[PDB]
Amino acid sequence: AKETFYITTPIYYPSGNLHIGHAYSTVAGDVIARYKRMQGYDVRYLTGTDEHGQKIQEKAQKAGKTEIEYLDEMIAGIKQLWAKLEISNDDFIRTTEERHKHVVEQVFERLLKQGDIYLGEYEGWYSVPDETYYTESQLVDPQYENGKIIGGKSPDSGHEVELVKEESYFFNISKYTDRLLEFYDQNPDFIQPPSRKNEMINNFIKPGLADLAVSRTSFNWGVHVPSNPKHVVYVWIDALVNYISALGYLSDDESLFNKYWPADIHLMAKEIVRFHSIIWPILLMALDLPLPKKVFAHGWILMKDGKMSKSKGNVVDPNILIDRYGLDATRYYLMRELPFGSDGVFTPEAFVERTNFDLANDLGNLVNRTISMVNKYFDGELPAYQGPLHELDEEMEAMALETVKSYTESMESLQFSVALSTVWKFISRTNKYIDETTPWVLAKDDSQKDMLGNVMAHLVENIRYAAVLLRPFLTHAPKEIFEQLNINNPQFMEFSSLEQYGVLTESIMVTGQPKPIFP
Ligand SMILES: Clc1ccc(Nc2nc(NCc3nc4ccccc4[nH]3)nc(N3CCOCC3)n2)c(Cl)c1
Numbered sequence: 001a002k003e004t005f006y007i008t009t010p011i012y013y014p015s016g017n018l019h020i021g022h023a024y025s026t027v028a029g030d031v032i033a034r035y036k037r038m039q040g041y042d043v044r045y046l047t048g049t050d051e052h053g054q055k056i057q058e059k060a061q062k063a064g065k066t067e068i069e070y071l072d073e074m075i076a077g078i079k080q081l082w083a084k085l086e087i088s089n090d091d092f093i094r095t096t097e098e099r100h101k102h103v104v105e106q107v108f109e110r111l112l113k114q115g116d117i118y119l120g121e122y123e124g125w126y127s128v129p130d131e132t133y134y135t136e137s138q139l140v141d142p143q144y145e146n147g148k149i150i151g152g153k154s155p156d157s158g159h160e161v162e163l164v165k166e167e168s169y170f171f172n173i174s175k176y177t178d179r180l181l182e183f184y185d186q187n188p189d190f191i192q193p194p195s196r197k198n199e200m201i202n203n204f205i206k207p208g209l210a211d212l213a214v215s216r217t218s219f220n221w222g223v224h225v226p227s228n229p230k231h232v233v234y235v236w237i238d239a240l241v242n243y244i245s246a247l248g249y250l251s252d253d254e255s256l257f258n259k260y261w262p263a264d265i266h267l268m269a270k271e272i273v274r275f276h277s278i279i280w281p282i283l284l285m286a287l288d289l290p291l292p293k294k295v296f297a298h299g300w301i302l303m304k305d306g307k308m309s310k311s312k313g314n315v316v317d318p319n320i321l322i323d324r325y326g327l328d329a330t331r332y333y334l335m336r337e338l339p340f341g342s343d344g345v346f347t348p349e350a351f352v353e354r355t356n357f358d359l360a361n362d363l364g365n366l367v368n369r370t371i372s373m374v375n376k377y378f379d380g381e382l383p384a385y386q387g388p389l390h391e392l393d394e395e396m397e398a399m400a401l402e403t404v405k406s407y408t409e410s411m412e413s414l415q416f417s418v419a420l421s422t423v424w425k426f427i428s429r430t431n432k433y434i435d436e437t438t439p440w441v442l443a444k445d446d447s448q449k450d451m452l453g454n455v456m457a458h459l460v461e462n463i464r465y466a467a468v469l470l471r472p473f474l475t476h477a478p479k480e481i482f483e484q485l486n487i488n489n490p491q492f493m494e495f496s497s498l499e500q501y502g503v504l505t506e507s508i509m510v511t512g513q514p515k516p517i518f519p
């Protein structure tokens with residue numbers, strides 16, 4: 001077998017308007033997926049949607065549609081974005097799918113039988129419009145009476161909160177506390193970034209874990225608890241098991257599950273990392289199922305006003321960006337501007353600057369300079385590579401291998417903006433190499449055609465290296481670079497083709513008519 005690799009994005013909630021940060025997750029998952037497939041893994045890459053709850057019932061009803069009708073339309077639009085981003089997801093899990101709903105049912109009923117889930121009462125500070133409960137310390141403008149909390153406001157919307165008591169099934173999770181802590185100890189790389197682990201052991205595990213209310217009686221649109229249909233499965237169990245339902249767990253064909261579980265990486269935004277680090281492995285322990293090998297939270301893409309939403313007036317539509325500026329530009333900015341363990345920022349100015357200077361100038365003009373010259377000096381015939389003939393070739397070819405080495409180390413540690421900048425260090429140095437070798441000077445001396453060709457050989461081989469490294473990130477530039485150069489063998493486009501510098505042992509006819517990589 002190709003060794004398997006299973007990567008996931010969270011399931012998105014179909015409110016209707018998607019930012020660059022929802023886009024960030026799918027694009028990054030895609031970079032990981034494309035990269036793993038290039039390394040020879042049997043990849044499965046999952047995304048999908050969280051389709052249940054009170055808020056969808058309401059959305060549907062305002063739009064004047066049934067839930068499904070409303071849902072199908074939100075999802076058509078979601079899947080359209082991911083097609084337009086060229087997300088290489090192998091499947092798309094909808095929580096409204098029988099395959100998912102059947103898992104939810106069975107999972108719930110089993111934890112009931114085991115005695116992990118019990119009937120009690122939830123009490124909390126509820127916000128009607130937010131469809132969300134808040135802790136006393138999360139309240140804004142709290143109201144006190146003789147030292148006791150009596151009311152306050154939602155920190156999201158600022159609507160008044162109201163104390164609600166309600167009947168809930170509860171999943172007893174603190175019973176798995178010491179196992180979880182042992183699982184963290186035996187799996188040190190589990191939580192990425194790892195600085196995220198202690199804040200969580202501190203803030204959430206050691207206080208320690210409260211029983212989790214996992215159903216409600218207050219909505220209809222959702223998976224009903226079979227032994228008790230008045231109760232509907234709340235977000236925790238419904239959303240998490242997306243990752244195992246998509247694989248045919250507990251169906252009649254569990255081959256995908258047997259093949260791909262456990263996941264190698266759950267990728268997520270930081271707001272739900274706690275849920276995937278604590279609740280999720282505990283639920284898996286309760287099901288006697290293997291735990292995922294890694295969970296990775298990325299930061300947010302912020303503005304100058306500051307975090308991104310419909311409300312502040314700071315929403316950026318990935319869609320218009322692809323249209324305005326091109327696909328490769330958009331994918332590039334997102335991956336290039338979000339460091340591991342940090343938030344990033346969208347400025348229209350920063351965007352155009354990164355697209356112009358990195359992509360169009362550094363890369364695009366290296367390619368056009370190089371073809372122009374092969375066409376001026378050799379009428380389109382690129383002399384086959386020979387060896388490191390020029391004083392600078394030996395350390396430049398070393399730099400090419402060092403580029404690939406340092407890129408791979410960044411790709412494995414999830415440090416994408418660093419893998420990209422490393423490639424661009426090599427990009428720039430290849431541009432420097434034209435200035436250094438001044439081919440036009442060589443071109444005037446007939447006894448220098450060998451060296452001229454050596455210089456050209458290097459430039460192209462340097463371009464080819466950068467195109468291969470960029471393939472997980474950019475779905476257009478690399479292919480269009482290989483065509484322009486008339487590198488037409490699929491093998492010369494793979495990672496293995498980078499182990500030894502100078503791979504074009506025969507003459508090739510670069511394009512007569514080179515156009516911009518980035519228009
Ligand atoms: Cl893969 C994945 C994706 C998301 C999440 N978390 C997550 N999602 C959502 N979505 C909206 C939402 N509301 C829902 C109601 C019923 C069923 C599914 C519902 N989904 N809402 C929350 N809330 C946490 C507490 O405040 C209120 C909402 N948490 C998890 Cl744990 C896993």
Ligand SMILES: [Mg+2]
Pocket residue numbers: 217229230231
């Ligand atoms: Mg009822």
